[PDB]
Write a protein that binds this DNA or RNA. Structure first.
Lengths: 72, 50, 60, 246, 105
RNA sequence: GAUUCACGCAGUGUUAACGUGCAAAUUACUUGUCAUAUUUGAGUAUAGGGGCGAAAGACUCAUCGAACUAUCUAGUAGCUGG
RNA sequence: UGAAACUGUCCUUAGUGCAGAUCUUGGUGGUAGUAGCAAAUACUAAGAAGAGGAAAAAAACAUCUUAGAACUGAAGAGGAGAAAGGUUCCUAAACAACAUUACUUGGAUUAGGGUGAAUCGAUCCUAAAUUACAGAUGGAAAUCCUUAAGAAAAGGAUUGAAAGGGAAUAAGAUUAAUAGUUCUUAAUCAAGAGAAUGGUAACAUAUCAUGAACUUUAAAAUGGAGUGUGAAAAUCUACGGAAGAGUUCUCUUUUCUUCUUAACAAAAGUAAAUUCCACUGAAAUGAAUCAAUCAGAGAAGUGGAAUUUAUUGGCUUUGUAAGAAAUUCAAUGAAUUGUGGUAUUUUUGCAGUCUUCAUAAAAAUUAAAGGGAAUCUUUUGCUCGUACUAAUAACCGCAACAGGUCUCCAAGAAGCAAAAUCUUUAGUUAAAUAGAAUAACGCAGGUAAGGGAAGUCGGCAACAUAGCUCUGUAAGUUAGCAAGAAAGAGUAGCUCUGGUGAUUAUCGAAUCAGAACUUUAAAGGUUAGGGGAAUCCGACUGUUUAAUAAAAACAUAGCAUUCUGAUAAAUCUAAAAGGUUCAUUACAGAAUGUGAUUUCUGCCCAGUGCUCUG
RNA sequence: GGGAACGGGCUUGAUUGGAACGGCGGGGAAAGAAGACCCUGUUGAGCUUGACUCUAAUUUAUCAUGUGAAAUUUUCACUCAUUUCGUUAAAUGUUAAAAAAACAUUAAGGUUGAAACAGGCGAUUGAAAGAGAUAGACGGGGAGUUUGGCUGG
RNA sequence: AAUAAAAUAUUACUUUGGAUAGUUUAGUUUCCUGGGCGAUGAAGAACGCAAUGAAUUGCGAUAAGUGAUAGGAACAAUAAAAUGUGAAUAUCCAAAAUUUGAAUGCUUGAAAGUAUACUAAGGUAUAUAUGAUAUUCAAUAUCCA
């Protein structure tokens, strides 16, 4: 019963959306985000996660105020 | 659920709003390749993970 | 039945409806739709006829 | 190998004390002037059952000697105390059952319980059900007295340590034979998670040092030095004797 | 036999989710939310339930008449009439004894 | 922590069905059990030479005599294939 | 064929020549019109719409209405919620794809519509637990501490429950869909604005009838079992009718349906149980329960007080309120809406009894007391959730998967029974396609002459006993059991008789026993123990390898051994005014072996351990 | 028959009409899976142990300067770092002067009423213990690794 | 012995598939110049804004855009309006800049919220550490009348 039957009771969320990164990686019982490293001030980045760095970093968003400054 | 937070309901409403197709007039523009929205999903076809 | 900004409460909606249309409001019921708009149900005083206000607004 | 269950007990994750319905901390009132140069009178309002311990606890109510109000204590019941009784604590208290006196004002051969090992520490020794300590001798030279601990050991204490006269209630608790595994299950309702104890020999070599082979046996002596590292310290530690006694 | 449904969104038979099925017009049965059972006051000494005070919820004594939550007697509403008689005798008899014991015995 | 039946549960036997299945462990009858060492929801605690185990090396997201994931890493191969 | 670039020679350069690597990526065959589209009892007739039942029976035809026949059988295939899903809800147009045939159907395509709260919840409080400033620790990241270390917080900070606690809303109607939320009517709550009498006493008086600091008490707020009983609802039933429907060639003064009432308040009439008060003082001891249990620190008796009994005050009754609603009749308008029960079940309280080496939460918040400091009308009630499924099609399993997933309401028959079986209200007739033929071999359910385990590793599988009543019951035994031992007899239908009560002859309860007569000689439609004599293991109830082992394995109580005076023992951590047993204290904590009870545990200290006061 | 010693193909013969339907289980050394038994590899992993080499924890000695004595270097006496505790840091020190389950508070200019002062909040331990460094012992609790070859397997 | 249904063989044409050929608003590498963010709130995330938009793009309650400076007649899928009295377009400029985020009055889960002061609503300020100055204090800590 480790296969099909045991999947029926899965109706309790472990992660929900995080306030800082918008992903569903906020652990409800650990009170921290698995992806962006919430309340920790620094963003969670690792050298072994090089793809994770090229997915969310500088230049992946709007750059509302930095696009004018560097252009200036 | 029946009970939901305020912000969570608005992110549910936006998912409803984005499940629409290309309007006909947009398809008649010159040099147009966008015919169907490939970001479409249905409640019984794919769960949106939120 | 109006559509208002979600950041407005029944107290400000009641004042705004009176100010904009010069009527009397005795009850406001609001619900926030899925899209994001706050639908308001405004009931006017018995001596104010709502049907004539609709024609002035443009619904008729 | 793995970590034995003895090692896992020191972490305190599922082995924490089940102290939710406990009444409080059973101890004497804090030492002050009126307990050192006079007497305070306490009223035994009620006798109650504290989960996880065999002796009943008494709710004693002293008046506040310095301010206006009450001062609610929680003593361990001496065998004989009743509701509505008056008990007196202090250096001048009479030698009646239930009264708290400094250990130096008690005659030789007297019986005390809830003794203080160090003055003002509100009770350490002789606290279990039916247990008591007996005063052996005094020494006015250095103001120290000797008492006999319930294990037969003799201990020397400062003569101003407080103690309650009498015997802790609930004697004979362990003389009734448990009969069912269910009854032993209910004993640890307000205690730690230790009851169903699997024999080490029934385990596997990874889990325990006793985890045996094709026959359930230990294979090496079960008497170990005190300096054994945790994990291999299983059996009898620093044992000077074994076998049955004649 | 008419079968009913929970009106509120509670779905479990907890103490606060007690219901009573009453009958209404046309043979329809509706659902009433019934209150919990409270306890009355107790004497501070003997722990016996006092007489003359109703067994209602603590906030409901605010709606009670000012004379319907206490008994017109010294230590009324906190002590039984027997709890008070012994108080008077203790106060008087002990003071009398302390007048012959000390004060020119 | 008596004997049983029932709502449920389990999984003794048929070593029945099925075995490119209803199903990556299910079905039918039979059997056992069916409230105090009971059954169960939500919350909460315990994390990889760690935890948890009425102890089977069992369980730890279909993964366990050491999980999953990424990096060192195009690890090394006197061996096999081209 | 194709329609804009390309070729020869010499040198130079190389990501330069493929049949293989279970090679990589893509495309495609035989298999093959083959295996299949067979769990969930079941559909038929007439009509409508539609291109879509034609025809030499092409034997089948999706959707909707009516009729017939059926199934889930009220612990449901019913009516509603929590998690999860997220627009799947409703309507209209439309069917290319999808739901193993088809579809006019759809949880599918397109486009609009839909979720209304002072009273329901979140918001508020704290529980297990969780996280901050300063401090402590660490090379570091960071860890510790949660009131202890602080010039911090009258006293201890943050979070933590849509099942724990909590101020206050009900009935009817209404929408294609929301409704304790809208409408009508009727209420409630919070925040406001405009130094008293009576009673012997228990105690009592539409606000009344002052009551600060400070302190205390109580409530919120507390297990389970089993027995008795009050009350309501449901079912059943008695009397009395009103209205409508069914049967009626054979009868039936007959069978069936309706005869209702909210929140909040009032107080004609009137209950059960418990606890107190006054008079008096019990023995010739009384009183009382199903059981108990109680009495000179005072019984029974009489007279009182109080509280509980789903809102005021439990039931009837009353305002609400008949104007509503239900059942009929007429073409909007008219008719009625008594009284009971020594029956059963459920719910809800109450009363004492039993049980624990188990004693079965806290805060927000409220009231009262001790004390004596001081001298009716009207306004407002903010933010957020609210649609729908909640499952043999909306959830998790790749899916419209026979698997899994927490709850509430709950009719008749029959029976000990919430059992099997059949029906009522509600729901549905479709839920991976049919038609013809009726071969072998299969899957599921059966029967059998004579014999009766001769089959086989093995009575595997099947057969067989089976309810109730009476009689009767062995060895063995821890004296409790074995025991439903084993064994034997009875049981139907019809017509009668007697026993078991209440009020002063009438009224009611299903239960037991007995007697004639008849027959197909009677538990058996369904449900429903095979029995006996021994041996081995485990004492027992219990747990176990999710997915080949449920056991003789683990656990268990019992027995025993070892260490420890708490600044300790065990033991987590890199460290730490750090952490666990420990809210603890030898009848305790920690570490082990054996495995109930009875009986007995023999000899050996040389070796290896451990220890020593040497 | 021979062949890698059990051919559908080769050699010699027996014999053959093309397409197939329902069954069936002899063969296709049928399918599923880089044999899981055995061996080899200077390939591993779990577990054990006085296998080799180490290590956490435990333990022992020396160093790390509190005063004041006394002996022949432990042996003591104090507190002053230090250890362990307790409270609302709530009368410390020295002078002066068991009859009763009830109540107990906001006192009749500014000092008495309610005594003054100590340079110690109250105890406990104590120059020893603990942590550090170096050195010996113990240490499968744990880490790494190894466990020759030939051989009628 | 016999037939060519099936089977086989070649070519042409069609079909399934997308190789080959032609092609490039895309990449790779080297070199040159810089290496110009943030409490005056960054990077990132969310939500919202077009006459008809779902994504994407641009932008922020002044919204696929405003003012100013250059610029000179367009846009287009379909309508409208405005337009040489200045349409598209560009910019190191000006105004404006929702919720968050180091996120900083307090709380934050998917949480709706909320206290004080200043200037009913609206807007500012209030985290921790920290330098300088001013000011109010605490300690018989050192003296001292």
């Amino acid at each position: 019963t480790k296969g099909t039957s045991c999947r029926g009771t899965r109706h309790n969320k472990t992660h929900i959306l995080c306030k800082r990164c918008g992903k569903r990686s906020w652990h409800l019982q650990k009170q921290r985000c698995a992806s962006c490293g919430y309340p920790d001030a620094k963003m969670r980045q690792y050298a072994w996660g090089y793809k994770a760095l090229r997915r969310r970093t500088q230049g992946t968003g709007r750059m509302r105020h930095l696009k004018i400054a560097l252009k200036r | 659920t029946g009970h939901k937070g305020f912000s969570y309901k608005l992110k549910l409403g936006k998912k409803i709003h984005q499940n629409r197709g290309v309007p006909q007039w947009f398809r008649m523009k010159t040099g147009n390749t966008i015919n169907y929205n490939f970001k479409r999903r249905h409640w019984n076809r794919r769960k949106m993970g939120m | 039945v109006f559509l208002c900004e979600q950041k407005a409460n029944k107290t400000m909606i009641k004042k705004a409806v009176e100010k904009r249309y010069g009527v009397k409001v005795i009850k406001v019921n609001t619900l926030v739709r899925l899209d994001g708009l706050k639908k308001a149900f405004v009931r006017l005083a018995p001596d104010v006829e709502a049907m004539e206000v609709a024609t002035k607004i443009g619904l008729f | 190998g793995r970590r034995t269950l003895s090692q896992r007990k020191g972490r305190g994750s599922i082995f924490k004390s089940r102290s939710h319905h406990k009444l409080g901390v059973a101890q004497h009132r804090a030492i002050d002037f009126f307990e050192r140069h006079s007497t305070v009178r306490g009223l035994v309002k009620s006798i109650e059952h504290d989960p996880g311990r065999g002796a009943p606890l008494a709710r004693v109510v002293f008046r506040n000697p310095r301010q206006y109000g009450l001062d609610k204590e929680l003593f361990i019941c001496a065998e004989g105390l009743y509701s509505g009784q008056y008990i007196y604590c202090g250096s001048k208290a009479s030698l009646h059952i239930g009264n708290v006196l400094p250990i130096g004002q008690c005659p030789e051969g007297t019986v005390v319980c809830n003794v203080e090992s160090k003055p003002g520490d509100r009770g350490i020794i002789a606290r279990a059900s039916g247990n008591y300590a007996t005063v052996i001798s005094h020494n006015a030279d250095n103001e120290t007295t000797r008492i006999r601990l319930p294990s037969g050991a003799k201990k020397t204490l400062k003569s101003n340590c407080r103690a309650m006269v009498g015997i802790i209630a609930g004697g004979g608790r362990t003389e009734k034979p448990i009969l069912k595994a269910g009854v032993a299950y209910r004993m640890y309702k307000a205690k730690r998670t230790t009851w169903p104890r699997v024999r080490g020999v029934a385990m596997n070599p990874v889990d325990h040092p006793h985890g045996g082979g094709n026959h359930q046996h230990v294979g090496h002596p079960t008497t170990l030095k005190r300096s054994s590292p945790p994990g291999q310290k299983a059996g009898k530690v620093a044992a000077r004797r074994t076998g049955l006694i004649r | 036999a008419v079968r009913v449904t929970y009106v509120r969104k509670h779905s479990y038979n907890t103490k606060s989710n007690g219901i009573r099925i009453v009958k209404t017009a046309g043979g329809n049965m509706t659902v009433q939310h019934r209150q919990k059972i409270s306890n009355g006051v107790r004497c501070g000494d003997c722990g016996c339930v006092l007489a003359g005070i109703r067994h209602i919820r603590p906030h409901q004594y605010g709606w009670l008449g000012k004379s319907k939550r206490t008994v017109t007697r010294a230590y009324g509403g906190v002590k039984c009439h027997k709890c008070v008689q012994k108080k008077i005798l203790r106060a008087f008899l002990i003071n009398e004894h302390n007048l012959i014991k000390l004060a020119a015995a």
